[PDB]
Amino acid sequence: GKTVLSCRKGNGSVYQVHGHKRLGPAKLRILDYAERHGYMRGVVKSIEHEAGRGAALARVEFRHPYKFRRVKELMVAPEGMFTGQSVFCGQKAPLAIGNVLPLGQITEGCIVCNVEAKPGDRGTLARASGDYCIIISHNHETGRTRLKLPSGQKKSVPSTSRAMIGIISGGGRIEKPVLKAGNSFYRFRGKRNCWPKVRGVARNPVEHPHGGGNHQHIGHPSTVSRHSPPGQKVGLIAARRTGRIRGGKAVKGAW
Amino acid sequence: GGRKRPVHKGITYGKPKTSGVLGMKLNKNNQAVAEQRLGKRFGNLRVLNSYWVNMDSTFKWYEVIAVD
Amino acid sequence: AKRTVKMGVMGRYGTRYGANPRKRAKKLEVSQHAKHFCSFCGKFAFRRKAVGIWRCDGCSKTVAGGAYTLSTPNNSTVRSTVRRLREL
RNA sequence: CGGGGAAACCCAGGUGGAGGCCUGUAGCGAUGCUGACGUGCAAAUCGCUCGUAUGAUUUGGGUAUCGGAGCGAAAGACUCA
RNA sequence: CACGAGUUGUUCGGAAACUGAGCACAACGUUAUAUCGUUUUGUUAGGAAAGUGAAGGAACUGAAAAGGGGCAACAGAGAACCUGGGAUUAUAUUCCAAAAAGAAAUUGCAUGUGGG
RNA sequence: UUACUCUCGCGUUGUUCGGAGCGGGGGCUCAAGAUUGAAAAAUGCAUUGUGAGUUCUGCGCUAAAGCAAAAACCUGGGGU
RNA sequence: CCAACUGCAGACCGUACUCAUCACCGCAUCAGGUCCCCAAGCAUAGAAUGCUCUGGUACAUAGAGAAAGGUACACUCAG
RNA sequence: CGGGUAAACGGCGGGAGUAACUAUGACUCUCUUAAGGUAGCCAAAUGCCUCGUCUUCCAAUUAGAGACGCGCAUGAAUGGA
RNA sequence: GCACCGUCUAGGUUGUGGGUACCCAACCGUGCUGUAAACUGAACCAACGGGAGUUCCGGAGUCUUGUUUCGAGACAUCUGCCAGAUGGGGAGUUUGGCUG
Ligand SMILES: [K+]
Ligand SMILES: [K+]
Ligand SMILES: [K+]
Ligand SMILES: [Mg+2]
Ligand SMILES: [Mg+2]
Ligand SMILES: [Mg+2]
Ligand SMILES: [Mg+2]
Ligand SMILES: [Mg+2]
Ligand SMILES: [Mg+2]
Ligand SMILES: [Mg+2]
Ligand SMILES: [Mg+2]
Ligand SMILES: [Mg+2]
Ligand SMILES: [Mg+2]
Ligand SMILES: [Mg+2]
Ligand SMILES: [Mg+2]
Ligand SMILES: [Mg+2]
Ligand SMILES: [Mg+2]
Ligand SMILES: [Mg+2]
Ligand SMILES: [Mg+2]
Ligand SMILES: [Mg+2]
Ligand SMILES: [Mg+2]
Ligand SMILES: [Mg+2]
Ligand SMILES: [Mg+2]
Ligand SMILES: [Mg+2]
Ligand SMILES: [Mg+2]
Ligand SMILES: [Mg+2]
Ligand SMILES: [Mg+2]
Ligand SMILES: [Mg+2]
Ligand SMILES: [Mg+2]
Ligand SMILES: [Mg+2]
Ligand SMILES: [Mg+2]
Ligand SMILES: [Mg+2]
Ligand SMILES: [Mg+2]
Ligand SMILES: [Mg+2]
Ligand SMILES: [Mg+2]
Ligand SMILES: [Mg+2]
Ligand SMILES: [Mg+2]
Ligand SMILES: [Mg+2]
Ligand SMILES: [Mg+2]
Ligand SMILES: [Mg+2]
Ligand SMILES: [Mg+2]
Ligand SMILES: [Mg+2]
Ligand code: NA
Ligand code: NA
Ligand code: NA
Ligand SMILES: [Zn+2]
């Protein structure tokens, strides 16, 4: 046979990110001495849109702590942030929308976004538009904090990790039907070469395990083992169950 | 470690007798390999001999004597 | 006189994409082209530029919020919760 | 902007110029005559007729991905007859 | 077919001298084998890659500033000149000579004049 | 500036603007043109008035699509 | 040091011709293919189509000439 | 070994008796499966027999349409209408 | 057992112009001069003081049984080597004869 498309995508080539129009990575400030001991105050200068991203980005200007110059930061903007607003980041920052505080200083039951999984990572959780995390509890003896993630799972992180107060802007995006093939074309133009999609049963046996036959059909079960080699692991990978879900929907993911 | 045969995706052709990819061994020892590496890198010297100096889980170290 | 009975702005689609999908998109289409109230200044002059980006004609101020409306209902709840926790 | 109504709203006349909208050049294609030619003008062309023509549109230069492999809105199509 | 001729620029196009999709020298690593890999998400390399402003008494000597050296657009950025000619067999915004047919703009270095 | 007092006013072909300062009087400035002259008649060949077309320019700047970067240059804040 | 004035000097490569029913690819001076700029008058909605001033061309083997049968971006036919 | 899962691959029955003319069986026994095809639809691009049977269309229709259904071998995201 | 290494500290408790309003010492605290909904100013190449024109200190705390910091941690895909399952993802090969 020949190589399957899912395996071919791993070489890179014509399947990489279209990033020419993007403004750069979005991240928090660097966890420095001022952030660890006091606070820093910056000003929001502009709010902008980036190709391929549903949330708005904010440019925030700070003063350099050691030299005579200005520093510009690009961050994911929570809903309600406006130009001219003051942003406080550090240990002694007050509790308000847009500020960045250590998790140990945030009251239980609060809504946060742009959460650091590890201290100094500059934000890796709850970044897509309309998403957020919920603080559950603190453990002062262990120095840890419990969080509920957008997926519904629960995670424990060190209390030194930082977070921003509020929810990510741009929520409600997926409620509007697309209605046209051209709209999907423009939607994926800013992201990558992954559209349109061709069904596996519409291909030939040389290219896909589902191809061939005098009827369009899969001749074997479409649930495949976790141990299947690349080129064979297509379909429903290591599925615990199939079919329409009756009753409550369980939380997805590993134990 | 042992030598891995450099074929695309670990696929061999021909008789089944020549199908091993991981269990083959190089017909030349690591001391000779180290001497050849040094000699190819520094072409203005002459290699005389070498000896074993140390070893760990991943690496072996030899000392090579050269003359000008 | 009134030019359509049921579909106001979706009339540009003719007879194509189906009644229910057109109906669901109409509510969000109307919202994203209307003028919203500005708490700064006092005018109904907030217009969406790009998804999640709103600019005031009078204030000349830019605010981040909402894909198709200026403020999401979930945002209003969060502001009240944060204010209450701060006052503790 | 005219008329009606207690109110919610209803009827009529203009303005404006939306749409993977319609007729139709250039462009991009190739339905039928199973037409011409079939030691040809041509190792796939010619005539009339025909599809679409503001968009998932057409096109120049540059640049990236290949032979147990590449690419493919998927015909085992295409990769210098 | 044979013999003999013809393409003239401070300003036109390129380069000197930009960056883009991108390439891959050095460096490091790997391979029995470099003819392999990394090399723009501000950016090489376990990584000591800055070689001269002022000075100070006329050549020296050394402070400052993180992230090596290049290439890739004759349709993107950039770019100081126009008309007339009776001036060719063939070139011209390129040739014309003191009444330059003439009228300009711009770069480098020097000399007066004025001001400081 | 009792301008919107009780149908407020200005304005476009057109989807609007004003106590966060409309309209009127008098001014400052920018962009595109017009006019007077030098060039320029010494050249060229053997005239100055209206309608139609025409993207330079101005009218400031669909979208889950929101429209490259750098060299070079300009101005300012400090200091001398 | 700065402003006009003035004096001198302004280096390198390209530049003929073609761009196509004869100058390029298709074995060829092949009814195929090949990117860009300027685009007059009348009819008319008009870059449709028909004719015309400027510019260009008369190059495509020809002469004589009512057989049958053909091809045609050529027609007509009583009931 | 023991649990779950079909919008996973897939599957979804036969025999006889019986109503005051006859016919047909609402009804009753019997063998059996993991379950025995539900709502719908049809001589349909899926029906062998087959040019099925009735009506309509014509002077005359192996064609067309509307009905009927024991459906060789229709049927529900292998998606049905 | 006693010495030495081996010490400092923010803050808290107890009619117009130009100026004054301390020190205690002890505990708490642990390197602290700014904000406590928000709605766009500025900040660099030291002023000053002291010891012996030009130095050296302070302003700007000192020290290092030494790790850049944070999170794990002798576990771990962390490295190499043996061993067993699974494995059309892939390779090689085969798929008798007679015969109206
Ligand atoms: K694609
Ligand atoms: K199949
Ligand atoms: K098929
Ligand atoms: Mg990338
Ligand atoms: Mg097929
Ligand atoms: Mg296969
Ligand atoms: Mg199908
Ligand atoms: Mg399979
Ligand atoms: Mg090895
Ligand atoms: Mg072999
Ligand atoms: Mg060797
Ligand atoms: Mg059409
Ligand atoms: Mg034919
Ligand atoms: Mg086939
Ligand atoms: Mg010749
Ligand atoms: Mg010659
Ligand atoms: Mg990279
Ligand atoms: Mg680049
Ligand atoms: Mg570099
Ligand atoms: Mg250019
Ligand atoms: Mg030039
Ligand atoms: Mg010529
Ligand atoms: Mg008024
Ligand atoms: Mg020429
Ligand atoms: Mg031409
Ligand atoms: Mg010819
Ligand atoms: Mg030709
Ligand atoms: Mg007319
Ligand atoms: Mg024409
Ligand atoms: Mg015409
Ligand atoms: Mg001929
Ligand atoms: Mg002729
Ligand atoms: Mg004839
Ligand atoms: Mg007739
Ligand atoms: Mg049934
Ligand atoms: Mg049937
Ligand atoms: Mg008939
Ligand atoms: Mg029928
Ligand atoms: Mg089902
Ligand atoms: Mg079926
Ligand atoms: Mg550590
Ligand atoms: Mg095989
Ligand atoms: Na970019
Ligand atoms: Na093999
Ligand atoms: Na229109
Ligand atoms: Zn406002």
Chain A nearest CA to C85, separation (Å): 7
Q: What one-character DSSP code corresponds to residue A252?
A: P
For ligand 24, the distance from its centroid to the CA atom of residue C83, given in whole angstroms, is 80
- Does any strand D atom come closer than 7 Å to the Cβ of A181? yes
Of the candidates A186, A167, A183, A168, the one whose C-alpha atom is nearest the C-alpha of residue A52 is A186
Are the beta carbons of A28 and A162 closer than 8 angstroms?
yes
CB contact under 8 A, C75 and A107: no
DSSP per-residue string spanning A159-192: TT-EEEES-BSS--GGGS----HHHHHHHHHTT-
Phi, psi of A42, rounded to the nearest 5 degrees: -125, 170
CB contact under 8 A, A169 and C52: yes
CA–CA gap between residue A124 and residue A163 (Å, rounded): 10
Are the beta carbons of C28 and C10 closer than 8 angstroms?
no
Residue numbers in A near C61 (CB within 8 A): 82-84
Which residue of C lies nearest to A54 if distances are taken between CA atoms?
C51
For ligand 41, the distance from its centroid to the CA atom of residue A118, given in whole angstroms, is 15
Question: Annotation-wise, does B18 bind a ligand?
Answer: yes
Measured CA to CA in angstroms, residue A240 lies from A18, A26, A142, A227 at distances of 35, 36, 35, 15
Q: CA angle A223-A224-A228, nearest 5°?
A: 175
Interface present between A and C (3 or more CB pairs within 8 Å): yes
DSSP per-residue string spanning A27-93: ------HHHHHSEEEEEEEEEE--TT-SS-EEEEEEE-SSSSSEEEEEEEPBTT-BTT-EEEEETT-
Of the candidates A207, A162, A133, A169, the one whose C-alpha atom is nearest the C-alpha of residue A35 is A162
Chain A nearest CA to C8, separation (Å): 17
CB contact under 8 A, A49 and C86: no
Rg (CA), chain B: 17
Cβ contacts of A22-25, under 8 Å, gap ≥ 24: A22/A50, A22/A51, A22/A52, A23/A48, A23/A50, A23/A57, A23/A74, A24/A74, A25/A74
Which nucleotide, over all strands, has the C1' atom closest to the CA of A4?
Answer: I89
Of the candidates B64, B65, B62, B63, the one whose C-alpha atom is nearest the C-alpha of residue B30 is B62
Phi, psi of C25, rounded to the nearest 5 degrees: -75, -20
Q: Assign residue A207 a region: left if phi > 0, alpha if psi is -120 to 50, beta otherwise?
A: alpha
* A9 CA, D79 C1': Å apart: 19
Three state DSSP letters for A113-153:
ECECCCCCCCCCECCCCCCCEEEEEEECCCCEEEEECCCCC
CB contact under 8 A, A173 and C51: yes
Which residue of C lies nearest to A52 if distances are taken between CA atoms?
C51
Phi, psi of A201, rounded to the nearest 5 degrees: -70, -10
Residue A234 half-sphere exposure, CB side, CA atoms within 13 Å?
A: 17
* A102 CA, E38 C1': Å apart: 37
- Report the structure determination method: cryo-EM
Amino acid at A128: A
- Does any strand E atom come closer than 7 Å to the Cβ of B7? no
Q: Where are the alpha helices (DSSP H) in chain C?
A: 19-33, 73-87
For ligand 18, the distance from its centroid to the CA atom of residue A13, given in whole angstroms, is 17
* B40 CA, E46 C1': Å apart: 24
CB atoms within 10 A of CB C64: 26
Which residue of C lies nearest to A107 if distances are taken between CA atoms?
C85
Q: ω into residue A196 within 30 of 0, thus cis?
A: yes
Assigned token pair, A23: 């403004």
Question: In what helix (H) or strand (E) does residue B53 lie, and over which residues does it extend?
Answer: strand B46-55
Measured CA to CA in angstroms, residue A27 lies from A42, A57, A75, A154, A162 at distances of 15, 10, 5, 23, 12
- Closest residue, CA to C1' of I37: A96
Q: Where are the alpha helices (DSSP H) in B14-63?
A: 30-41
Find chains touching chain B: ≥3 CB pairs under 8 Å: none
- Does any strand F atom come closer than 7 Å to the Cβ of A45? no
